[PDB]
Amino acid sequence: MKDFSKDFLFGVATASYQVEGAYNEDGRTMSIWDTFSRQDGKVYKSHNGDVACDHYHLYKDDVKMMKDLGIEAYRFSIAWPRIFPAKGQYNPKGMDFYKRLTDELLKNDIKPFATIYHWDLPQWADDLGGWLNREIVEWYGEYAEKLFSELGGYIKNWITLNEPWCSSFLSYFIGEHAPGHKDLGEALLVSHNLLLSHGKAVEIFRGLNLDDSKIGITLNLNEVFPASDSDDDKVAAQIADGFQNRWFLDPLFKGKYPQDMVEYFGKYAKVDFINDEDLKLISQKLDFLGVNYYTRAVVQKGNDGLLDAVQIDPGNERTEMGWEIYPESLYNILMRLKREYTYDMPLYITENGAAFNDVVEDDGRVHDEKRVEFLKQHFKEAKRFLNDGGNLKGYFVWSLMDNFEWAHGYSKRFGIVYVDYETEKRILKDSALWYKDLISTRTI
Ligand code: NA
Ligand code: NA
Ligand code: NA
């Protein structure tokens, strides 16, 4: 038979600010990441997405490239600052790009998966308070409703948010991502307003009753292991698991924030944003969950401070991010969802991939054998989940091409396609050739 059914979606994924470029064209105004990347010290060597992969201009070549690989689905994000470059000011020229992009995908037999928000909040919105201002629920709802109305004939699979853990804790508490605040209370409120905005889009979506159309959300999830069997490390792992995973899984799928984290965070900051009405909106039924999976964490107790778990190095192989290559946690997380949160609901892997030190050799090829092996090991775990009864509908490799990796700039290469940024040349890596074979044979 086939390890992956004909209906299973082999995909690749990008995000608008990471690949598009054309940052000041056809009416687009600045996002918080345009601004953040221009603040000294925030992004590697002051890299920014002014040009990136120039995918805005090269999209026809990139779709042809995906068609020749046999790609069956393409996950991309839509740039809010192209669609509403000012508050309440719709930009048809911005919408026209996503119409010609998705028209090209459909005409080449690629199913579009559109992420509504992938971190490029318009600067006008942040200047009004951004995700800290509860009014953003209405601004986001107006944006999402415009996308549903204008693109409903083009796009049948919608993702409200990408990785709200990053938009909240990494952007407002740790401060690595835009807008770069460092305040736990702000990050917690932002996490709530993000989830409430997701809920508003779902409410609007259900009222539209679009034929054969599905909506979900994308979460980055890990698996946390205690470094030892001690009670100290067990509590440390519990907190780390609540911080990364349950803080978002529980309100979405149980209608309640995890109470151990509410009490834990409450010792350090306000948690008075929680109320029954908001959690009802947050926990509306979805059609699927998107899982972004990369690695696990091994943690031991720290200094009894705020979220101070010591990161243990188990001594295994890692990517250029320093992320352990541990494919078994892909299966473990999908199974955990099946047994604790999503049950029989369809799942997609909406991101999985790896950054390695890619070089174009004298033969003009990129022999990224570590990425070939990485993807092989993780797709084998996807196959094992399917054969054990898991409801996995597709798998999107991060990324189609090397791109702007946020605070790391262009220094981390995640693509199955190499980009020579000086010429914008695309070079298929060996991992892309391996993926092409996997799609064609559906065998691993
Ligand atoms: Na860009
Ligand atoms: Na810059
Ligand atoms: Na749901």
Numbering used by the authors: 1 to 444
Mind quoting what the paper says about this structure?
The substrate-binding pocket can be divided into the glycone, aglycone, and gatekeeper regions; in addition, the bound sugar substrate is cleaved via a retention mechanism using two glutamate residues. Four loops are present above the Bgl substrate-binding pocket, forming a large cavity for the nascent substrate to access.
In the P1 and P212121 crystals, the L3 loop regions of the TsaBgl-Data I (folded L3 loop conformation) and TsaBgl-Data III (straight L3 loop conformation) chain A molecules, which showed the most significant differences in L3 loop conformation, were carefully analyzed. While the straight L3 loop had a relatively straight loop structure in the direction pointing away from the substrate-binding pocket, the folded L3 loop was oriented toward the substrate-binding pocket. Conversely, the substrate accessible width of the substrate-binding pocket entrance with the straight L3 loop conformation was approximately 35 Å, and the proximate distance between the L2 and L3 loops was approximately 7 Å. We speculated that the straight L3 loop conformation made the substrate entrance wider, thereby providing easier access to the substrate than the folded conformation. A Tris molecule was shown to act as an inhibitor of TsaBgl β-glucosidase activity.
